[PDB]
Swiss-Prot record, chain A:
Keywords: Cytoplasmic vesicle, Endocytosis, Endonuclease, Hydrogen ion transport, Hydrolase, Ion transport, Membrane, Nuclease, Transmembrane, Transmembrane helix, Transport. It comes from Mus musculus. Its main location: membrane. It comes from the Eukaryota. This is Ribonuclease kappa.
UniProtKB/Swiss-Prot annotation, chain B:
Belongs to the V-ATPase 116 kDa subunit family. This is V-type proton ATPase 116 kDa subunit a 1. Disruption phenotype: Embryonic lethal. Knockout embryos die at 5 to 6 dpc, before gastrulation. Subunit of the V0 complex of vacuolar(H+)-ATPase (V-ATPase), a multisubunit enzyme composed of a peripheral complex (V1) that hydrolyzes ATP and a membrane integral complex (V0) that translocates protons. V-ATPase is responsible for the acidification of various organelles, such as lysosomes, endosomes, the trans-Golgi network, and secretory granules, including synaptic vesicles. In certain cell types, can be exported to the plasma membrane, where it is involved in the acidification of the extracellular environment. Required for assembly and activity of the vacuolar ATPase. Predominantly expressed in neurons in the cortex and in the dentate gyrus, CA1 and CA3 regions of the hippocampus (at protein level). Expressed at lower levels in astrocytes, oligodendrocytes and microglia (at protein level). In the cerebellum, present in Purkinje and granule cells (at protein level). It comes from Mus musculus (Mouse).
From Swiss-Prot, chain C:
The chain crosses the membrane at residues 5-25, 33-53. It is found in: Membrane; Cytoplasmic vesicle, Clathrin-coated vesicle membrane; Cytoplasmic vesicle, Secretory vesicle, Synaptic vesicle membrane. This is V-type proton ATPase subunit e 2. Pfam families: ATP_synt_H. It comes from Mus musculus. GO terms for biological process: synaptic vesicle lumen acidification. It is a multi-pass membrane protein. Coiled coil: none annotated. V-ATPase is a heteromultimeric enzyme made up of two complexes: the ATP-hydrolytic V1 complex and the proton translocation V0 complex. The V1 complex consists of three catalytic AB heterodimers that form a heterohexamer, three peripheral stalks each consisting of EG heterodimers, one central rotor including subunits D and F, and the regulatory subunits C and H. The proton translocation complex V0 consists of the proton transport subunit a, a ring of proteolipid subunits c9c'', rotary subunit d, subunits e and f, and the accessory subunits ATP6AP1/Ac45 and ATP6AP2/PRR. Residues 26-32 are cytoplasmic. The keyword Transport applies. Its main location: membrane.
Swiss-Prot record, chains E, F, G:
It is a multi-pass membrane protein. The record marks E134 as: Essential for proton translocation. V-ATPase is a heteromultimeric enzyme made up of two complexes: the ATP-hydrolytic V1 complex and the proton translocation V0 complex. The V1 complex consists of three catalytic AB heterodimers that form a heterohexamer, three peripheral stalks each consisting of EG heterodimers, one central rotor including subunits D and F, and the regulatory subunits C and H. The proton translocation complex V0 consists of the proton transport subunit a, a ring of proteolipid subunits c9c'', rotary subunit d, subunits e and f, and the accessory subunits ATP6AP1/Ac45 and ATP6AP2/PRR. Signal peptide: none annotated. Keywords: Cytoplasmic vesicle, Hydrogen ion transport, Ion transport, Membrane, Synapse, Transmembrane, Transmembrane helix, Transport, Ubl conjugation. The chain crosses the membrane at residues 6-28, 51-71, 88-109, 127-147. This is V-type proton ATPase 16 kDa proteolipid subunit c. Ubiquitinated by RNF182, leading to its degradation via the ubiquitin-proteasome pathway. Residues 72-87, 148-150 are lumenal. It comes from Mus musculus (Mouse). NCBIfam families: V_ATP_synt_C (TIGR01100). It comes from the Eukaryota. It holds the Pfam family ATP-synt_C. It is found in: Cytoplasmic vesicle, Clathrin-coated vesicle membrane; Cytoplasmic vesicle, Secretory vesicle, Synaptic vesicle membrane.
């Protein structure tokens, strides 16, 4: 299954997606007072000091990790198909 | 100092035609000598080797036709090696016959 | 930051690879190619980094930033 | 069938070679007027000995040497690590006999410039990764059919892509442009503490007066230049485009001037080989003089503007580059005389 | 100081620059694609050899886009209008010079490719003119920037 | 400082963002399919093959769609005639650039079909040139979405 | 004191001048490169000897530049308005004269190049007319200089 030629293409594409994903999630987890431009809020978290800011980057990193996990499940089944042929 | 064109030179190569059958094979193996058309103003068919070219064309017709037949049967070819099997014989005409 | 400490460090790196590296390289069949490769890479590297750093001396015109980043770097630095 | 093919075809080539000969009117020998490398002649005569050995006939196969008006061929040895680059050079034809081969200089100046143009760390990594896959599957690709010509032409210059990618990685490092963003490897390098406390400014923030400008006249807002490459504080600023307009063009013209002058310089070595001081005395010298008088003053202007004048002369100081153009006016304006030094006019 | 009707002219400059760069590149790509699509059938072993002027034609859009985004960055109706007219003239004229260059590039590329099958030897001899036209488009960019500095 | 009729500049901006882009899209739709129908008569085995070039024109239709929709979402009369004509200039800009792009794409597609009338080698390369033209469109689009993000 | 928006004139001046210059050079390229590609087959050993105009149109490019740069350097925001309309007229004039030079040079260059291959004897004799037309172009830069500022 998975159309072996397009399955190897998917192996390469999904490995690239996983690596870019874990990298992006890692820089999101860093959130070193940098990417305030990517937080959708108006006069909510601008008060009281730095509260409820790094959480959004942490959740985005977790979403990236989960996406990488799904692509890695696909890559694992692709390893299984490689062993099948 | 940048590398320049390596030094080449002209040559007057006298050689008896009998030993030329050996010398041309050897020089082909070397892959380092360039000849030229020393009879530029001479017909194709006056060089007294053309009919051998016809023979090798006949050979190649038969060879390519049998390779096509091998493609018909769908038989993979060995291709083990033996790349430098390069003699200069005369009896090989009969064997290809 | 230091005006010329990293500058001198990096220049020493490039000088060392430019005068001591190639003589250390074995004189192989491609001796000249490799030596020239190393030296050219080092000098072009040096020139590029030097130009970049010399640009950032004497900050003349004024940068800008929004009030939100102002508050946050007050809260984060 | 395959060995039959190789034998027959090499036989064809042998006979074609015999066809290129000179049959004497009566003499049974053939007289050739051919070329031959000099450096390997020992192996050539060794091959002649091999030929005599194959059929013992004691035919000396004498090759005399001569030189006349004939123009000889052109060769320069390449290998697996440099052949594709020589192919790029040969895409534009080939130069005269005994001309200098500037190929290695190109081997460095092409990845370098291509990288300066292509200022991306991650993409350089990806291209180098493609090249590394290709290098580690060199033999497997050679054995495999290049059914796609695009992969064939990509593989023909494999090491070229590898080296390009390496330099692209490095220029991405310097530009601080890894996927469009600058890394905070070191401090902000500016460190604006008094922004509204001792910044001679009130608390009109949030509502109104959002985007505000500093002034270097008051220290504390300049914690030195960034140690390595572009300052990452510009990642959260927009006038970086103006600053980079001032910087990058000057950088590029410097690089091009230097490479161009090197290119002109190599001609002198062509002529020292050919012993042609006529194309040097009336050639090289006025050429270099003209390029110097054109360009060196500009280069010195840029280098001096970089570090000569601080923030406490801005409203009278020279423009970022335009005064270099004001030189061409051939008549000097007496308003706002912003010179690099006394008597520079 | 900065009354209304201020930076109309700079907006028109950006629009004109990008548009006329698109016009030049459109004409160039049309002519070059016609020439290659016709000639390549003759010589299927020079097809990737024949695609020079495509990437060269991309430079026209690149020119117009650099100048356009520059103008957009430097754009506001709060300007004193002594830069809006600069943006109008510069964008209009860089776009139209790009149109000129794209015209020449397209038709000369078509001619050069038409001269391929019979003699595939003047590779360099045809790209010389294409390079020269690229340089004209550059000189247009240069003067656009000269206005941009003012 | 702000007369009435304020949003009308952006209204015309959306309308123009559709008009000329639709013109070019219609030209491409008009052009490519004709040659592809001839090549359906002559070479039926490639009927499924020559499809992506055809829908390439719908992609320009979609650029017009997005630009006008953005202006629709950015409608407001509380502007002092600044960003409204900014949208107007953006709409004209997209319209003319996309019209030029569509015309060139139609030409190159038809020429490539005529080239592939015999040789199958051309198909992929001509499609690469076609995609190049699409990218030259994407350029002007990015300028448009810069102006609409205002 | 000066009439408001006195910077309007000369800036369009230089811009239109460079447009015309780009057109002139583009037309020179247009005719000459295609002519060379046509004469490729006849005398292949005389191709690079006959490529004069590919640098000659750079001369008119340089004219357009020099006028544009001098005008830009002679600019001021609140100009007296005596010098800026003059910049407009001078730039338009030199640009159009440059387009004329490009038109004539392209025409006669194609004409000569067609009549050169069979009998390359009259090569320099054809230069006699070609570079002469370039001098007719130089007259325009001269008058661009006489009223560049006053």
């Amino acid at each position: 299954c998975c159309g072996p030629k397009l399955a190897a293409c998917g192996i390469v594409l999904s490995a690239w997606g996983v690596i870019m994903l874990i990298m992006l999630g890692i820089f999101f987890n860093v959130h070193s007072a940098v990417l305030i431009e990517d937080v959708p809020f108006t006069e909510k978290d601008f008060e009281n000091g730095p509260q409820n800011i790094y959480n959004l980057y942490e959740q985005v990193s977790y979403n990236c990790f989960i996406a990488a996990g799904l692509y890695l499940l696909l890559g694992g089944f692709s390893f299984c198909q490689v062993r099948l042929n | 100092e940048l590398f320049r064109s390596e030094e080449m030179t002209l040559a007057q190569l006298f050689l008896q035609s009998e030993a030329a059958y050996c010398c041309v094979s050897e020089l082909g193996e070397l892959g380092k000598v360039q000849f030229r058309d020393l009879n530029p103003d001479v017909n194709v068919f006056q060089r007294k080797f053309v009919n051998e070219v016809r023979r090798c064309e006949e050979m190649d017709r038969k060879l390519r036709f049998v390779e096509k037949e091998i493609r018909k049967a769908n038989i993979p070819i060995m291709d083990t090696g033996e790349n430098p099997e390069v003699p200069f014989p005369r009896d090989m005409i009969d064997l290809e016959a | 930051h230091s005006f010329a400490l990293p500058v001198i460090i990096f220049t020493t790196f490039w000088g060392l690879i430019g005068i001591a590296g190639p003589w250390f390289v074995p004189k192989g069949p491609n001796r000249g190619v490799i030596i020239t490769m190393l030296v050219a890479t080092a000098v072009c590297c040096y020139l590029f980094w030097l130009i970049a750093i010399l640009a950032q001396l004497n900050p003349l015109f004024g940068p800008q930033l929004k009030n939100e980043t102002i508050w946050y770097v007050r809260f984060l630095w | 069938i395959r060995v039959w093919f190789i034998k027959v075809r090499k036989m064809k080539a042998i006979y074609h070679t015999l066809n290129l000969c000179n049959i004497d009117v009566t003499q049974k020998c053939l007289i050739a007027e051919v070329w031959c490398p000099v450096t390997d002649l020992d192996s050539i005569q060794f091959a002649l000995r091999r030929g005599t050995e194959h059929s013992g006939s004691t035919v000396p196969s004498i090759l005399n040497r001569m030189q006349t008006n004939q123009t000889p061929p052109t060769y320069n040895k390449t290998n697996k690590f440099t052949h594709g680059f020589q192919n790029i050079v040969d895409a534009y034809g080939i130069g005269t006999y005994r001309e200098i081969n500037p190929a290695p200089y190109t081997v460095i100046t092409f990845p370098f410039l291509f990288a300066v143009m292509f200022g991306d760390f991650g993409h350089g990594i990806l291209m180098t990764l493609f090249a590394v896959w290709m290098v580690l599957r060199e033999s497997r690709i050679l054995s495999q059919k290049h059914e796609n010509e695009m992969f064939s032409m990509v593989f023909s210059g494999r090491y070229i892509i590898l080296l390009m990618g390496l330099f692209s990685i490095y220029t991405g490092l310097i530009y601080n442009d890894c996927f469009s963003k600058s890394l905070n490897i070191f401090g902000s390098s500016w460190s604006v503490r008094p922004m509204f406390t001792q910044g001679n400014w009130t608390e009109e923030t949030l509502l109104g007066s959002s985007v505000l400008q500093l002034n270097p006249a008051i220290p504390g807002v300049f914690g030195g230049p960034y140690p390595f490459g572009i300052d990452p504080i510009w990642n959260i600023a927009t006038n970086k485009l103006t600053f980079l307009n001032s910087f990058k063009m000057k950088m590029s013209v410097i690089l091009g001037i230097i490479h161009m002058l090197f290119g002109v310089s190599l001609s002198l070595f062509n002529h020292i080989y050919f012993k042609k001081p006529l194309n040097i005395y009336f050639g090289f010298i006025p050429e270099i003089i003209f390029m110097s008088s054109l360009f060196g003053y500009l280069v010195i202007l840029i280098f001096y503007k970089w570090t000569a004048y601080d923030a406490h002369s801005s409203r009278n100081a020279p423009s970022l580059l335009i005064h270099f153009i004001n030189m061409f006016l051939f008549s000097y304006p007496e308003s706002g005389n912003a010179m690099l030094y006394s008597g520079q006019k | 100081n900065n009354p209304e009707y201020s930076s109309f002219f700079g907006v028109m400059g950006a629009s004109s620059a990008m548009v006329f760069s698109a016009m030049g590149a459109a004409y160039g790509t049309a002519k070059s694609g016609t020439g290659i699509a016709a000639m390549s059938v003759m010589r299927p072993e020079l097809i990737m050899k024949s695609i020079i002027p495509v990437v060269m034609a991309g430079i026209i859009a690149i020119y117009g886009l650099v100048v356009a985004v520059l103008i957009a960055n430097s754009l506001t109706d709060g300007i004193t209008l002594y830069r809006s007219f600069l943006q109008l003239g510069a964008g209009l004229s860089v776009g139209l010079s790009g149109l000129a260059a794209g015209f020449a590039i397209g038709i000369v590329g078509d001619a050069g490719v038409r001269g391929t099958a019979q003699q595939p030897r003047l590779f360099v001899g045809m790209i010389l003119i294409l390079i020269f036209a690229e340089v004209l488009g550059l000189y247009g960019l240069i003067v656009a920037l000269i206005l941009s500095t003012k």
